[PDB]
Amino acid sequence: TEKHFKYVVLGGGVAGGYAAREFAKQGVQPGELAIISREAVAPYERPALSKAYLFPQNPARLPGFHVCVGSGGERLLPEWYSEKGIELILNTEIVKADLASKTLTSAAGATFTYEILLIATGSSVIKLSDFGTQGADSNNILYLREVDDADKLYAAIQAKKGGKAVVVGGGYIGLELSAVLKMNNLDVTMVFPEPWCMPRLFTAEIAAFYESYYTNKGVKIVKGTVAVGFDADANGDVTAVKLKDGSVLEADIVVVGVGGRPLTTLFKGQVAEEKGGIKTDASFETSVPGVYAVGDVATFPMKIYNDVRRVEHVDHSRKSAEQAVKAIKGKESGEAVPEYDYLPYFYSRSFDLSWQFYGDNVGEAVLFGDSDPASAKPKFGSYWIKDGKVVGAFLEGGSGDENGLIAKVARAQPPVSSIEELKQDGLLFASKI
Ligand SMILES: Cc1cc2nc3c(=O)[nH]c(=O)nc-3n(C[C@H](O)[C@H](O)[C@H](O)COP(=O)(O)OP(=O)(O)OC[C@H]3O[C@@H](n4cnc5c(N)ncnc54)[C@H](O)[C@@H]3O)c2cc1C
């Protein structure tokens, strides 16, 4: 009929799951907390979907990558929630939220009320149909966001093995999926309009490592164009991808990753919005008191650069959720909570490659170490320098110890005397803060 909970988390993804963990840690009592989710499963570590979920043998499958294993904490199975009297309400989609009345409505008519609301609704894919691309509705043109998408992609990879796959996009989705499709032995061509891959993060030299490495694996890369059409066949299945530059690629499966948008749609006009997200303070509270927003949807004060930003980082989803739960319990008990202080951190893994990045990629980049893609065990990095201070750091193929160092460089923002003593001595510069 109508259920009330003191705390309601809306969205059962990374941040919802991590928030539930912090609620338990902070001494949440049975009956107080609900987590409302549109998916059929308990919170899971979404980055595995474009990685081990799609491996040729013994792909990762739930319940193995439920949160919080992805950061090495305990696995929250559905029975973890119910053991704590945390109500995990699955297969439920909120289609209406009314903040004044503190009321949420499901597609099927159930209503939920709350005292405190944690919005963790994440992001949705941008699709090529969004802007009328010809034949974009053809079957086997596929997007990847949730585990249900992952199963369909996996089923289509099985059907089309030994086929041709086109990947549209050069973001981390494009790169990761291009790799997995080549590991499943399809003939892969990657296509994107930007001039090199990962264009919001990589510099031209970084990108040239990855693009050469991919081409050596057999993944072709076409840059500076876009798909403007798709040919199909009688059952309605994609057969071809028509490029803007007149060219045409054979295709049995197309995987698209041209970015996303935060699902703020329920709250439009009800909270302040900024840079596409829901504006939060340093404790993740919105314009409306007792309503918080975390993970992809939140636009928050980035204290280290004295800026306001919105990010799409698994690590931020985890930390922002913890911060909001600590702020809510802080408000109840009077006790002071320190301002969110996030250091941006992104990572990816494709083929047998693995890189990290920390900080801000502004200013002049300088490479160090070894960029030859023909090394069996490639290792190299890059620092970004602004105002005689290193403000960002990247590393491909670091041990785990070294990743620790660059993170420290990124935080401390150490001066640069000599560029030369920095390029011979890339990882060795780090030690001298
Ligand atoms: C395939 C893939 C790979 C990724 N890889 C990486 C990576 O390698 N590194 C990295 O740092 N980041 C990665 N990201 C981003 C990361 O996965 C995080 O999940 C994301 O940044 C945000 O987590 P979140 O809790 O805000 O949103 P999500 O985890 O998307 O969760 C939002 C939840 O809310 C539910 N929901 C939304 N609207 C409603 C509604 N109206 N009613 C009910 N439920 C609703 C959604 O279905 C979902 O379950 C990746 C993302 C994807 C999709």
PDB file of N, CA and C and ligand atoms in Angstrom, residues 10-17 36-39 41 43-51 89 92-96 105 119-125 144-146 172-173 176-177 263 266-267 294-298 311-318 320-321 342 345-349, ligand 1:
ATOM      1  N   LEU A  10      17.620   5.947  -3.134  1.00  0.00           N
ATOM      2  CA  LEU A  10      16.999   5.751  -4.427  1.00  0.00           C
ATOM      3  C   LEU A  10      18.073   5.410  -5.430  1.00  0.00           C
ATOM      4  N   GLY A  11      18.152   4.158  -5.801  1.00  0.00           N
ATOM      5  CA  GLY A  11      19.121   3.662  -6.772  1.00  0.00           C
ATOM      6  C   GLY A  11      19.989   2.605  -6.123  1.00  0.00           C
ATOM      7  N   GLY A  12      19.986   1.405  -6.671  1.00  0.00           N
ATOM      8  CA  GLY A  12      20.725   0.266  -6.115  1.00  0.00           C
ATOM      9  C   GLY A  12      21.977  -0.080  -6.904  1.00  0.00           C
ATOM     10  N   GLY A  13      22.756   0.947  -7.206  1.00  0.00           N
ATOM     11  CA  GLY A  13      24.014   0.762  -7.875  1.00  0.00           C
ATOM     12  C   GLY A  13      25.155   0.845  -6.901  1.00  0.00           C
ATOM     13  N   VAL A  14      26.258   1.434  -7.357  1.00  0.00           N
ATOM     14  CA  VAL A  14      27.508   1.404  -6.623  1.00  0.00           C
ATOM     15  C   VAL A  14      27.339   2.210  -5.398  1.00  0.00           C
ATOM     16  N   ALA A  15      26.912   3.435  -5.597  1.00  0.00           N
ATOM     17  CA  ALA A  15      26.789   4.346  -4.523  1.00  0.00           C
ATOM     18  C   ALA A  15      25.686   3.942  -3.530  1.00  0.00           C
ATOM     19  N   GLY A  16      24.566   3.414  -4.021  1.00  0.00           N
ATOM     20  CA  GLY A  16      23.518   2.899  -3.112  1.00  0.00           C
ATOM     21  C   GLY A  16      24.027   1.781  -2.223  1.00  0.00           C
ATOM     22  N   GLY A  17      24.828   0.903  -2.809  1.00  0.00           N
ATOM     23  CA  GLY A  17      25.366  -0.223  -2.111  1.00  0.00           C
ATOM     24  C   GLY A  17      26.384   0.233  -1.102  1.00  0.00           C
ATOM     25  N   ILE A  36      15.895   1.433  -2.786  1.00  0.00           N
ATOM     26  CA  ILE A  36      14.962   1.187  -3.862  1.00  0.00           C
ATOM     27  C   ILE A  36      15.710   1.104  -5.192  1.00  0.00           C
ATOM     28  N   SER A  37      15.544   0.011  -5.911  1.00  0.00           N
ATOM     29  CA  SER A  37      16.280  -0.271  -7.121  1.00  0.00           C
ATOM     30  C   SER A  37      15.411  -0.847  -8.229  1.00  0.00           C
ATOM     31  N   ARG A  38      15.657  -0.339  -9.428  1.00  0.00           N
ATOM     32  CA  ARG A  38      15.063  -0.707 -10.706  1.00  0.00           C
ATOM     33  C   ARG A  38      15.551  -2.099 -11.251  1.00  0.00           C
ATOM     34  N   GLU A  39      16.743  -2.523 -10.837  1.00  0.00           N
ATOM     35  CA  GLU A  39      17.316  -3.789 -11.297  1.00  0.00           C
ATOM     36  C   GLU A  39      16.761  -4.961 -10.507  1.00  0.00           C
ATOM     37  N   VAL A  41      18.682  -7.279  -9.151  1.00  0.00           N
ATOM     38  CA  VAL A  41      19.756  -7.801  -8.305  1.00  0.00           C
ATOM     39  C   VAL A  41      20.252  -6.731  -7.364  1.00  0.00           C
ATOM     40  N   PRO A  43      23.016  -4.477  -5.357  1.00  0.00           N
ATOM     41  CA  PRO A  43      24.169  -3.661  -5.737  1.00  0.00           C
ATOM     42  C   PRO A  43      25.451  -4.404  -6.051  1.00  0.00           C
ATOM     43  N   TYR A  44      26.041  -4.022  -7.174  1.00  0.00           N
ATOM     44  CA  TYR A  44      27.197  -4.677  -7.724  1.00  0.00           C
ATOM     45  C   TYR A  44      28.172  -3.665  -8.310  1.00  0.00           C
ATOM     46  N   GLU A  45      29.368  -4.159  -8.556  1.00  0.00           N
ATOM     47  CA  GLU A  45      30.483  -3.358  -8.913  1.00  0.00           C
ATOM     48  C   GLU A  45      30.429  -3.237 -10.420  1.00  0.00           C
ATOM     49  N   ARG A  46      29.807  -2.174 -10.901  1.00  0.00           N
ATOM     50  CA  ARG A  46      29.441  -2.007 -12.315  1.00  0.00           C
ATOM     51  C   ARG A  46      30.613  -2.047 -13.308  1.00  0.00           C
ATOM     52  N   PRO A  47      31.825  -1.664 -12.855  1.00  0.00           N
ATOM     53  CA  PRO A  47      32.915  -1.681 -13.827  1.00  0.00           C
ATOM     54  C   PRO A  47      33.246  -3.085 -14.388  1.00  0.00           C
ATOM     55  N   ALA A  48      32.921  -4.146 -13.656  1.00  0.00           N
ATOM     56  CA  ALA A  48      33.214  -5.470 -14.148  1.00  0.00           C
ATOM     57  C   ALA A  48      32.375  -5.814 -15.413  1.00  0.00           C
ATOM     58  N   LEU A  49      31.298  -5.074 -15.677  1.00  0.00           N
ATOM     59  CA  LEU A  49      30.439  -5.385 -16.836  1.00  0.00           C
ATOM     60  C   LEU A  49      31.122  -5.315 -18.227  1.00  0.00           C
ATOM     61  N   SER A  50      32.064  -4.403 -18.392  1.00  0.00           N
ATOM     62  CA  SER A  50      32.781  -4.260 -19.641  1.00  0.00           C
ATOM     63  C   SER A  50      34.115  -4.942 -19.534  1.00  0.00           C
ATOM     64  N   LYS A  51      34.320  -5.735 -18.487  1.00  0.00           N
ATOM     65  CA  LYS A  51      35.561  -6.456 -18.299  1.00  0.00           C
ATOM     66  C   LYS A  51      35.279  -7.971 -18.152  1.00  0.00           C
ATOM     67  N   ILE A  89      14.516  -3.188  -1.957  1.00  0.00           N
ATOM     68  CA  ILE A  89      13.339  -3.327  -2.766  1.00  0.00           C
ATOM     69  C   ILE A  89      13.697  -3.309  -4.258  1.00  0.00           C
ATOM     70  N   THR A  92      11.756  -2.248  -8.878  1.00  0.00           N
ATOM     71  CA  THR A  92      10.877  -1.145  -8.560  1.00  0.00           C
ATOM     72  C   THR A  92      11.459   0.124  -9.148  1.00  0.00           C
ATOM     73  N   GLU A  93      10.675   0.832  -9.940  1.00  0.00           N
ATOM     74  CA  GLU A  93      11.151   2.033 -10.590  1.00  0.00           C
ATOM     75  C   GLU A  93      10.368   3.188 -10.081  1.00  0.00           C
ATOM     76  N   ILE A  94      11.031   4.206  -9.518  1.00  0.00           N
ATOM     77  CA  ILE A  94      10.335   5.397  -9.107  1.00  0.00           C
ATOM     78  C   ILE A  94      10.078   6.203 -10.392  1.00  0.00           C
ATOM     79  N   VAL A  95       8.835   6.574 -10.643  1.00  0.00           N
ATOM     80  CA  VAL A  95       8.492   7.452 -11.770  1.00  0.00           C
ATOM     81  C   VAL A  95       8.064   8.829 -11.277  1.00  0.00           C
ATOM     82  N   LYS A  96       7.865   8.977  -9.970  1.00  0.00           N
ATOM     83  CA  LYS A  96       7.554  10.286  -9.443  1.00  0.00           C
ATOM     84  C   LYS A  96       8.129  10.477  -8.051  1.00  0.00           C
ATOM     85  N   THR A 105       6.842   7.553  -5.909  1.00  0.00           N
ATOM     86  CA  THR A 105       5.847   6.656  -6.514  1.00  0.00           C
ATOM     87  C   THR A 105       6.470   5.731  -7.551  1.00  0.00           C
ATOM     88  N   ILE A 119      19.736  10.357  -3.055  1.00  0.00           N
ATOM     89  CA  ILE A 119      19.601  10.137  -4.507  1.00  0.00           C
ATOM     90  C   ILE A 119      20.882   9.594  -5.142  1.00  0.00           C
ATOM     91  N   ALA A 120      20.855   8.372  -5.660  1.00  0.00           N
ATOM     92  CA  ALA A 120      22.012   7.770  -6.247  1.00  0.00           C
ATOM     93  C   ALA A 120      21.568   7.105  -7.532  1.00  0.00           C
ATOM     94  N   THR A 121      20.963   7.871  -8.391  1.00  0.00           N
ATOM     95  CA  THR A 121      20.375   7.294  -9.575  1.00  0.00           C
ATOM     96  C   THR A 121      21.328   7.063 -10.752  1.00  0.00           C
ATOM     97  N   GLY A 122      22.564   7.545 -10.664  1.00  0.00           N
ATOM     98  CA  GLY A 122      23.550   7.310 -11.704  1.00  0.00           C
ATOM     99  C   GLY A 122      23.292   8.007 -13.053  1.00  0.00           C
ATOM    100  N   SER A 123      23.586   7.284 -14.118  1.00  0.00           N
ATOM    101  CA  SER A 123      23.612   7.874 -15.453  1.00  0.00           C
ATOM    102  C   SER A 123      22.849   6.987 -16.421  1.00  0.00           C
ATOM    103  N   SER A 124      22.381   7.553 -17.532  1.00  0.00           N
ATOM    104  CA  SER A 124      21.927   6.727 -18.650  1.00  0.00           C
ATOM    105  C   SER A 124      22.709   6.978 -19.928  1.00  0.00           C
ATOM    106  N   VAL A 125      22.755   5.954 -20.758  1.00  0.00           N
ATOM    107  CA  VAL A 125      23.406   6.084 -22.073  1.00  0.00           C
ATOM    108  C   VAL A 125      22.717   7.129 -22.962  1.00  0.00           C
ATOM    109  N   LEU A 144      25.816  -0.476 -23.294  1.00  0.00           N
ATOM    110  CA  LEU A 144      26.191  -1.206 -22.097  1.00  0.00           C
ATOM    111  C   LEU A 144      26.180  -0.286 -20.945  1.00  0.00           C
ATOM    112  N   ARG A 145      25.187  -0.486 -20.061  1.00  0.00           N
ATOM    113  CA  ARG A 145      25.084   0.213 -18.794  1.00  0.00           C
ATOM    114  C   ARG A 145      24.841  -0.698 -17.559  1.00  0.00           C
ATOM    115  N   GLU A 146      23.821  -1.539 -17.597  1.00  0.00           N
ATOM    116  CA  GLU A 146      23.418  -2.403 -16.486  1.00  0.00           C
ATOM    117  C   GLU A 146      23.583  -3.887 -16.827  1.00  0.00           C
ATOM    118  N   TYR A 172      36.346   5.245 -22.595  1.00  0.00           N
ATOM    119  CA  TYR A 172      36.734   4.036 -21.885  1.00  0.00           C
ATOM    120  C   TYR A 172      35.799   2.890 -22.228  1.00  0.00           C
ATOM    121  N   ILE A 173      34.534   3.199 -22.510  1.00  0.00           N
ATOM    122  CA  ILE A 173      33.627   2.144 -22.944  1.00  0.00           C
ATOM    123  C   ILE A 173      34.093   1.538 -24.266  1.00  0.00           C
ATOM    124  N   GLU A 176      37.608  -0.498 -23.693  1.00  0.00           N
ATOM    125  CA  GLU A 176      37.339  -1.747 -22.975  1.00  0.00           C
ATOM    126  C   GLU A 176      36.573  -2.745 -23.819  1.00  0.00           C
ATOM    127  N   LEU A 177      35.501  -2.332 -24.460  1.00  0.00           N
ATOM    128  CA  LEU A 177      34.724  -3.288 -25.241  1.00  0.00           C
ATOM    129  C   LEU A 177      35.418  -3.728 -26.511  1.00  0.00           C
ATOM    130  N   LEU A 263      20.852  10.796 -14.542  1.00  0.00           N
ATOM    131  CA  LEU A 263      19.422  10.713 -14.424  1.00  0.00           C
ATOM    132  C   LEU A 263      18.941  11.563 -13.277  1.00  0.00           C
ATOM    133  N   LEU A 266      13.805  12.955 -12.321  1.00  0.00           N
ATOM    134  CA  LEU A 266      12.758  12.958 -11.319  1.00  0.00           C
ATOM    135  C   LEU A 266      12.686  14.244 -10.511  1.00  0.00           C
ATOM    136  N   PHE A 267      13.797  14.959 -10.406  1.00  0.00           N
ATOM    137  CA  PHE A 267      13.923  16.049  -9.465  1.00  0.00           C
ATOM    138  C   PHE A 267      14.024  17.368 -10.138  1.00  0.00           C
ATOM    139  N   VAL A 294      24.569  11.791  -4.678  1.00  0.00           N
ATOM    140  CA  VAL A 294      25.892  11.238  -4.673  1.00  0.00           C
ATOM    141  C   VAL A 294      26.221  10.545  -5.991  1.00  0.00           C
ATOM    142  N   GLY A 295      27.492  10.136  -6.148  1.00  0.00           N
ATOM    143  CA  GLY A 295      27.941   9.411  -7.352  1.00  0.00           C
ATOM    144  C   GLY A 295      27.757  10.256  -8.621  1.00  0.00           C
ATOM    145  N   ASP A 296      27.454   9.633  -9.765  1.00  0.00           N
ATOM    146  CA  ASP A 296      27.438  10.388 -11.062  1.00  0.00           C
ATOM    147  C   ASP A 296      26.550  11.644 -11.041  1.00  0.00           C
ATOM    148  N   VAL A 297      25.455  11.637 -10.272  1.00  0.00           N
ATOM    149  CA  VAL A 297      24.498  12.731 -10.389  1.00  0.00           C
ATOM    150  C   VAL A 297      24.926  14.003  -9.722  1.00  0.00           C
ATOM    151  N   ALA A 298      25.867  13.912  -8.791  1.00  0.00           N
ATOM    152  CA  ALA A 298      26.179  15.061  -7.919  1.00  0.00           C
ATOM    153  C   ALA A 298      27.236  16.023  -8.489  1.00  0.00           C
ATOM    154  N   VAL A 311      31.723  14.322 -11.638  1.00  0.00           N
ATOM    155  CA  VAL A 311      32.576  13.273 -12.201  1.00  0.00           C
ATOM    156  C   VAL A 311      31.838  11.954 -12.321  1.00  0.00           C
ATOM    157  N   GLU A 312      32.404  11.054 -13.115  1.00  0.00           N
ATOM    158  CA  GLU A 312      31.863   9.719 -13.323  1.00  0.00           C
ATOM    159  C   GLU A 312      32.996   8.739 -12.979  1.00  0.00           C
ATOM    160  N   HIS A 313      33.187   8.493 -11.694  1.00  0.00           N
ATOM    161  CA  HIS A 313      34.334   7.728 -11.258  1.00  0.00           C
ATOM    162  C   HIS A 313      33.793   6.736 -10.257  1.00  0.00           C
ATOM    163  N   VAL A 314      34.110   5.462 -10.450  1.00  0.00           N
ATOM    164  CA  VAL A 314      33.667   4.473  -9.462  1.00  0.00           C
ATOM    165  C   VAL A 314      34.140   4.845  -8.057  1.00  0.00           C
ATOM    166  N   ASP A 315      35.299   5.451  -7.938  1.00  0.00           N
ATOM    167  CA  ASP A 315      35.874   5.657  -6.622  1.00  0.00           C
ATOM    168  C   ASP A 315      35.112   6.798  -5.943  1.00  0.00           C
ATOM    169  N   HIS A 316      34.771   7.806  -6.711  1.00  0.00           N
ATOM    170  CA  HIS A 316      33.898   8.847  -6.191  1.00  0.00           C
ATOM    171  C   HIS A 316      32.483   8.305  -5.825  1.00  0.00           C
ATOM    172  N   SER A 317      31.947   7.370  -6.592  1.00  0.00           N
ATOM    173  CA  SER A 317      30.637   6.880  -6.219  1.00  0.00           C
ATOM    174  C   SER A 317      30.679   6.274  -4.830  1.00  0.00           C
ATOM    175  N   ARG A 318      31.706   5.452  -4.592  1.00  0.00           N
ATOM    176  CA  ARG A 318      31.945   4.828  -3.294  1.00  0.00           C
ATOM    177  C   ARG A 318      32.178   5.827  -2.187  1.00  0.00           C
ATOM    178  N   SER A 320      31.683   9.321  -2.134  1.00  0.00           N
ATOM    179  CA  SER A 320      30.615  10.289  -1.973  1.00  0.00           C
ATOM    180  C   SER A 320      29.456   9.683  -1.127  1.00  0.00           C
ATOM    181  N   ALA A 321      29.131   8.438  -1.369  1.00  0.00           N
ATOM    182  CA  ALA A 321      28.058   7.765  -0.622  1.00  0.00           C
ATOM    183  C   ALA A 321      28.397   7.653   0.875  1.00  0.00           C
ATOM    184  N   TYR A 342      38.080  14.973  -2.154  1.00  0.00           N
ATOM    185  CA  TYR A 342      38.336  13.957  -3.185  1.00  0.00           C
ATOM    186  C   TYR A 342      39.536  14.308  -4.077  1.00  0.00           C
ATOM    187  N   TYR A 345      40.459  10.120  -9.465  1.00  0.00           N
ATOM    188  CA  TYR A 345      41.149   8.882  -9.655  1.00  0.00           C
ATOM    189  C   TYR A 345      40.381   8.081 -10.650  1.00  0.00           C
ATOM    190  N   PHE A 346      41.031   7.761 -11.756  1.00  0.00           N
ATOM    191  CA  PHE A 346      40.401   6.960 -12.777  1.00  0.00           C
ATOM    192  C   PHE A 346      41.297   5.795 -13.175  1.00  0.00           C
ATOM    193  N   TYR A 347      40.696   4.718 -13.629  1.00  0.00           N
ATOM    194  CA  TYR A 347      41.478   3.616 -14.065  1.00  0.00           C
ATOM    195  C   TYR A 347      40.761   2.862 -15.165  1.00  0.00           C
ATOM    196  N   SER A 348      41.539   2.037 -15.858  1.00  0.00           N
ATOM    197  CA  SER A 348      40.997   1.169 -16.889  1.00  0.00           C
ATOM    198  C   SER A 348      41.887  -0.030 -16.994  1.00  0.00           C
ATOM    199  N   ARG A 349      41.369  -1.085 -17.624  1.00  0.00           N
ATOM    200  CA  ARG A 349      42.132  -2.302 -17.918  1.00  0.00           C
ATOM    201  C   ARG A 349      41.569  -2.821 -19.202  1.00  0.00           C
TER     202      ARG A 349
HETATM  203  C1  LIG B   1      30.261  -0.527 -18.248  1.00  0.00           C
HETATM  204  C2  LIG B   1      30.862   0.448 -17.304  1.00  0.00           C
HETATM  205  C3  LIG B   1      32.204   0.400 -16.968  1.00  0.00           C
HETATM  206  C4  LIG B   1      32.745   1.293 -16.068  1.00  0.00           C
HETATM  207  N1  LIG B   1      34.072   1.205 -15.791  1.00  0.00           N
HETATM  208  C5  LIG B   1      34.611   2.089 -14.930  1.00  0.00           C
HETATM  209  C6  LIG B   1      36.022   1.988 -14.571  1.00  0.00           C
HETATM  210  O1  LIG B   1      36.736   1.077 -15.080  1.00  0.00           O
HETATM  211  N2  LIG B   1      36.494   2.883 -13.665  1.00  0.00           N
HETATM  212  C7  LIG B   1      35.720   3.824 -13.085  1.00  0.00           C
HETATM  213  O2  LIG B   1      36.198   4.635 -12.257  1.00  0.00           O
HETATM  214  N3  LIG B   1      34.416   4.007 -13.405  1.00  0.00           N
HETATM  215  C8  LIG B   1      33.779   3.170 -14.262  1.00  0.00           C
HETATM  216  N4  LIG B   1      32.392   3.358 -14.600  1.00  0.00           N
HETATM  217  C9  LIG B   1      31.503   4.370 -13.892  1.00  0.00           C
HETATM  218  C10 LIG B   1      31.018   3.613 -12.578  1.00  0.00           C
HETATM  219  O3  LIG B   1      30.546   2.367 -13.014  1.00  0.00           O
HETATM  220  C11 LIG B   1      29.888   3.965 -11.550  1.00  0.00           C
HETATM  221  O4  LIG B   1      28.738   3.076 -11.378  1.00  0.00           O
HETATM  222  C12 LIG B   1      29.340   5.266 -11.915  1.00  0.00           C
HETATM  223  O5  LIG B   1      30.482   6.156 -12.101  1.00  0.00           O
HETATM  224  C13 LIG B   1      28.292   5.702 -10.851  1.00  0.00           C
HETATM  225  O6  LIG B   1      27.808   4.918  -9.755  1.00  0.00           O
HETATM  226  P1  LIG B   1      26.358   5.429  -9.172  1.00  0.00           P
HETATM  227  O7  LIG B   1      25.912   4.745  -7.893  1.00  0.00           O
HETATM  228  O8  LIG B   1      26.246   6.962  -9.163  1.00  0.00           O
HETATM  229  O9  LIG B   1      25.398   4.996 -10.396  1.00  0.00           O
HETATM  230  P2  LIG B   1      25.026   3.498 -10.871  1.00  0.00           P
HETATM  231  O10 LIG B   1      25.966   2.445 -10.365  1.00  0.00           O
HETATM  232  O11 LIG B   1      24.629   3.612 -12.327  1.00  0.00           O
HETATM  233  O12 LIG B   1      23.639   3.207 -10.118  1.00  0.00           O
HETATM  234  C14 LIG B   1      22.386   3.914 -10.208  1.00  0.00           C
HETATM  235  C15 LIG B   1      21.249   2.919  -9.846  1.00  0.00           C
HETATM  236  O13 LIG B   1      19.962   3.567  -9.743  1.00  0.00           O
HETATM  237  C16 LIG B   1      18.994   2.837 -10.484  1.00  0.00           C
HETATM  238  N5  LIG B   1      17.937   3.805 -10.876  1.00  0.00           N
HETATM  239  C17 LIG B   1      18.092   4.863 -11.666  1.00  0.00           C
HETATM  240  N6  LIG B   1      16.967   5.561 -11.770  1.00  0.00           N
HETATM  241  C18 LIG B   1      16.063   4.919 -10.999  1.00  0.00           C
HETATM  242  C19 LIG B   1      14.622   5.111 -10.691  1.00  0.00           C
HETATM  243  N7  LIG B   1      13.917   6.177 -11.239  1.00  0.00           N
HETATM  244  N8  LIG B   1      14.058   4.206  -9.887  1.00  0.00           N
HETATM  245  C20 LIG B   1      14.707   3.138  -9.381  1.00  0.00           C
HETATM  246  N9  LIG B   1      16.022   2.899  -9.614  1.00  0.00           N
HETATM  247  C21 LIG B   1      16.711   3.763 -10.410  1.00  0.00           C
HETATM  248  C22 LIG B   1      19.789   2.317 -11.658  1.00  0.00           C
HETATM  249  O14 LIG B   1      19.137   1.274 -12.402  1.00  0.00           O
HETATM  250  C23 LIG B   1      21.048   1.866 -10.925  1.00  0.00           C
HETATM  251  O15 LIG B   1      20.866   0.563 -10.394  1.00  0.00           O
HETATM  252  C24 LIG B   1      31.873   2.369 -15.476  1.00  0.00           C
HETATM  253  C25 LIG B   1      30.521   2.402 -15.859  1.00  0.00           C
HETATM  254  C26 LIG B   1      30.005   1.477 -16.733  1.00  0.00           C
HETATM  255  C27 LIG B   1      28.573   1.548 -17.111  1.00  0.00           C
END
